[PDB]
Structures are given as C-alpha cells and as structure tokens.
Paper text:
The overall architecture of the complexes is similar to known Esx structures in that each heterodimer forms a four helix bundle with the CFP-10 and ESAT-6 subunit homologs each contributing an α-helical hairpin to the complex. The subunit interfaces in the four-helix bundles of the Esx complexes are similar to those of the previously determined Esx complex structures in that the intermolecular interface between the CFP-10 and ESAT-6 subunits is largely hydrophobic.
The WXG-containing loops are well ordered in the EsxGHms complexes and in most of the EsxEFma complexes but the majority of the connecting loops are disordered in the EsxOPmt subunit structures. The average amount of buried surface area in the subunit interfaces varies considerably [EsxEFma, ∼1605 Å2; EsxGHms, ∼1555 Å2; EsxOPmt (form I), ∼1025 Å2; and EsxOPmt (form II), ∼1175 Å2] and the percentage of the surface of each subunit buried in the complex interface is also highly variable, from 13.5–33%, and is related to the degree to which the termini of the subunits are ordered and to the conformations that they adopt.
Author numbering:
A (entry chain C): 5 to 91
B (entry chain D): 1 to 83
C (entry chain A): 5 to 94
D (entry chain B): 7 to 86
Write the structure that this text describes.
C-alpha cells in the first residue's frame, strides 16, 4: 500500500549511496595518482604494489555493488516502480 | 637544501587529502552496510547470494580497500617526513 | 589514462542523481497519497486521474533512467572500473 | 480541516519544484556526458535527451495537477 513508495524510496537512497561510493573510489584514485610527484625505487615499488592492489579491490567492490543494486538498489527500486505501474 | 624540505607544505597538505579519502571510504562503506541490513527483507536469492553472505563480503572488501588505500598514503607520508 | 578516473567519477555522479530522482519521485508519491483522503466525488476523481497518470509517467521516467544508467551512469562507471582493473593486472 | 489540507498543499508544491529542478539537472548532465554515450539499447543520446525532457514535463504537470486540484478544492471547503 504506502509500503511501496517507502520501499522504492529506500531502495533509491541505497542506490545513490552505492553510486557515491563508486565516485569516491575514483576520486581517491586521482588523489593517489597526483601524489606521484614524489617516489622512486622500493617506495615506488611499494606504491605501485599498493596501487595495483587498490585497483584490484575496487573491481571487487564495484562487482559487489552491482549485486546490491540488482537486489535492493537502483535496479531493484526501478523494477518495483514499473511493476506498480503495470499493476 | 633537500627537495623534500622544499615541497614539504604541499606534500603534507597532500597527505592530509589522501587521509581524508580513507575516512570517507570507511564511512560510506559503513553506511552502505547498515542500509543493506535495514533492507534485508527486500533481498532475494537473485544472484544466489544471500544478504548475510553479501554483508560479510561487503565489510571484508571495504576493510581491504581502505588498507590498500592507506598503504599508498603511508608511502607518501614516509617521504614527507623522510626530510 | 588519468582520463579514466575522471570518466568513472563523472558517470558514478550521474548514477547517483539518477537514483536521487527515483527517490524524489517516491517521496512525492507518499506526499500525494497522504493528501487524497480529504476530497470526495468530482474533486477526488480528478485527483485519482491525476494520480494514475503520475504513476504511469514515473514508470516511463524510471525506464528512461534505466537506459541512462547503462550508457553514462552507475552501470557504465562500474564497467569502466572493472574493465580498467582487468586490463591493468593482465 | 483547512490547515491540515493547506499544509499538504504546500508539502506537495515542494516536490513539484524538486521534480523539475533535478530533472533539469539530469538533462544538463546527460548532455555534458554526450561523448560517453553509445547505442547500448540502440537509443541515441539525442533521442534520450528529447524523450527525457518530454517525459519530465508530463510528470511534473501530472503532479502539479494533483497539488492544484487539492489547492482549488480546499479553498472551496473553508468557504463552505
């Protein structure tokens, strides 16, 4: 009844947060990229290693948010909204 | 002279900025986790992944993202104070 | 190269606003439902007709946001992020 | 009563303004990201821009129709 809009709203809000998370990872990546007026040798090696890892884990986090968006996020709320229109 | 002493103010400011992103990533991740819990009963076996399984994988991945990011931050600070 | 994080960011931000529209539509609907009660007959029928129309167009706008998302939004950004990671390690 | 109703009217007018503002903002952002757009479904960015704007007008007009009908009705109640 009134549950439906409240569900749609909440699923949208989670969906916005998932997207802001994604945006934040990218921004963080750009801040890290510009810190590269700095390193050389084994600290750059440590930095490159740490970077490669951070890229790797991001892909993981984006993969996980794809799953959540389908279940309770932006896709989920879109589905419910259109479903309520159909019915 | 030192070139590390010459750029100290900006390298420090830049450390401050990177660390700001550690905090933002932690916070946004915690919210996402709380909200995913709040919405548990809306979650179905769509992927075949339960909500409990996702919660756990989310927190694990987030803890790993922040540490990976903090490793880079530390690599920077090491120069700023190498001086 | 550094263009990639900018793109991912730009798209994720678009994806957020898409979700925030869906949220605004939903909050507008709650405010609409809670203000039907008052009316009766002709004034009500006009409201219900205006409501059924609004619920229809939200569906279309949601369908339209779904397209935006895949092209320049939440999903697009995810693909660029994940694609950047697979190319980076390989 | 008149206040409960008139409060709800003002509540709805908030959302009319909100729906418009963000839709326009979305319109602008989709244009700004035109170069990142391809025919995924098969829909061009121009097609989407036009369809988006058109659909944002009818959505806000649907909603304002509720707010107005609610507003015009309530004024009739207090005069009764």
């Amino acid at each position: 009844d009134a549950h439906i809009p409240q569900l749609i709203a909440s699923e949208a809000n989670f969906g916005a947060k998932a997207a802001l998370m994604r945006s934040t990872i990218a921004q963080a990546e750009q801040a890290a990229m510009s810190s590269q007026a700095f390193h050389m040798g084994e600290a750059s090696a440590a930095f490159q290693a740490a970077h490669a890892r951070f890229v790797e884990v991001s892909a993981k986090v984006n993969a996980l948010l794809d799953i959540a968006q389908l279940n309770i996020g932006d896709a989920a709320s879109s589905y419910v909204a259109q479903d309520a229109a159909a019915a | 002279m030192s070139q590390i002493m010459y750029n100290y103010p900006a390298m420090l400011a830049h450390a401050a900025e990177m660390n700001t992103y550690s905090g933002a990533l932690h916070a946004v991740g915690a919210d996402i986790a709380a909200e995913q819990h709040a919405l548990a009963s809306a979650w179905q076996g769509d992927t075949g992944m339960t909500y409990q399984a996702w919660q756990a994988q989310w927190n694990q991945a987030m803890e790993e993202l922040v540490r990976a990011y903090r490793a880079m931050a530390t690599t920077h600070e090491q120069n700023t104070m190498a001086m």
